[PDB]
Write a protein that binds this ligand. Structure first.
Ligand SMILES: N[C@@H](CCC(=O)N[C@@H](CS)C(=O)NCC(=O)O)C(=O)O
Ligand SMILES: N[C@@H](CCC(=O)N[C@@H](CS)C(=O)NCC(=O)O)C(=O)O
Lengths: 217, 217
């Protein structure tokens, strides 16, 4: 089988776990654990970081036979090409390129606030900003059923993830965008997905390490 | 022609400027300026940020007639596809994806150092880490002429830039790494790049905005 390695956290690997399932990949995961405070030992990983033969060692990684990959986006694109889940048209490619990089931006912003020592001070001004981030998702999708077009592509996995996360963080952030909420239910309703969500392998939380101030446990 | 817009800095757009020159593209630039401390006015951009028809307004943006794109990597890929500078085989495609992503991480690490009020006391820890980053790019290029393989692809633009920037930060960081000093000279040796480095348009520094602690003027 293929081997997925990551922390025993949702982090940024939710979209890869979901694509592996949707595509019926035959895989196993090694979920590394971080020691507890104060130290938050990372030795379970560090001990083999440089022994897997990865060009640029990092988590997540994917071993797929003789193919070895790091960087979540490259893993996602690798799977997308393997299982034909890319945009077919120039327009679809442009939309997937954009979204793919927009979700990373929006992710880094959440990670930054979340691991910010002044998280409580920070919520307030950060939440005033969500509505305009959702609007931009909302208008981009418009009436299309999926982000690049007429077909589910790997970016739907990235966009579902990030929208789901913003929603955990601000339950009402989406009341004003029925099309986003509609997107989250169309996505949760794909066949292998609904099944994966009721399984032992499913991990929606925690999101971050115990380092976090949010969704850290 | 095509319109590229970004700040009047190198920032994260050096690779696009290079790619437009290497490909003999017809293009005009809009270089936005920002005020000086203490409030660093961004009003030149802000006045037109929501007036361009951009899906997710941001800098850099590229406009190619109908097509309006944001996110640097999406602009890079659009230019790559147009001018056939994409990997050709799967092996080239994975190497491209990884590098693209590895570049952005190494770039985010430098930006975070450089925008930390603690620059000076923090810098010496940052320097200790460089040798290991460069060894990774080094062992990855190996003996290949270019990053994805035997031909220049869009990723050599992303790689030239991040090696060039770290090289400006630590002039001696590449001494142990011949294939990289060499890569730097092969790239610069490209006809249209060599031509462009001497032109009126060339903008090497500053790299960061007036806010940074390093290379801000
Ligand atoms: N940009 C990388 C993020 C890599 C990264 O930041 N990995 C964190 C987990 S989110 C890590 O623990 N890295 C392993 C390491 O550096 O040793 C990706 O998108 O895959
Ligand atoms: N992930 C984006 C980063 C973009 C970004 O943060 N843009 C900066 C300059 S590097 C900016 O000034 N944005 C202007 C704004 O927010 O209105 C990219 O790769 O293009």
């Amino acid at each position: 089988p293929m081997i997925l390695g990551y922390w025993n956290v949702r982090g940024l690997t939710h979209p890869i776990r979901l694509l592996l399932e949707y595509t019926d990949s035959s895989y196993e995961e090694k979920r590394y654990a971080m020691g507890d405070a104060p130290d938050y030992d990372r030795s379970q990983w560090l001990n083999e970081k440089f022994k897997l033969g990865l060009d640029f060692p990092n988590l997540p990684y994917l071993i797929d036979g003789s193919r070895k990959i790091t960087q979540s986006n490259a893993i996602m694109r690798y799977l997308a090409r393997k299982h034909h889940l890319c945009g077919e048209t120039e327009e679809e490619r442009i939309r997937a390129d954009i979204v793919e990089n927009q979700v990373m931006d929006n992710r880094m912003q959440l990670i930054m606030l979340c691991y910010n020592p002044d998280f409580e001070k920070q919520k307030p001004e950060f939440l005033k900003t969500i509505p305009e981030k959702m609007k931009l998702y909302s208008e981009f999708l418009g009436k299309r059923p999926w982000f690049a077009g007429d077909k589910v592509t790997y970016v739907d996995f990235l966009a579902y993830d990030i929208l789901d996360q913003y929603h955990i963080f601000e339950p009402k952030c989406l009341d004003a965008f029925p099309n986003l909420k509609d997107f989250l239910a169309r996505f949760e309703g794909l066949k292998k997905i609904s099944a994966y969500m009721k399984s032992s392998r499913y991990l929606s939380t925690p999101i971050f390490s115990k380092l976090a101030q949010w969704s850290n446990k």
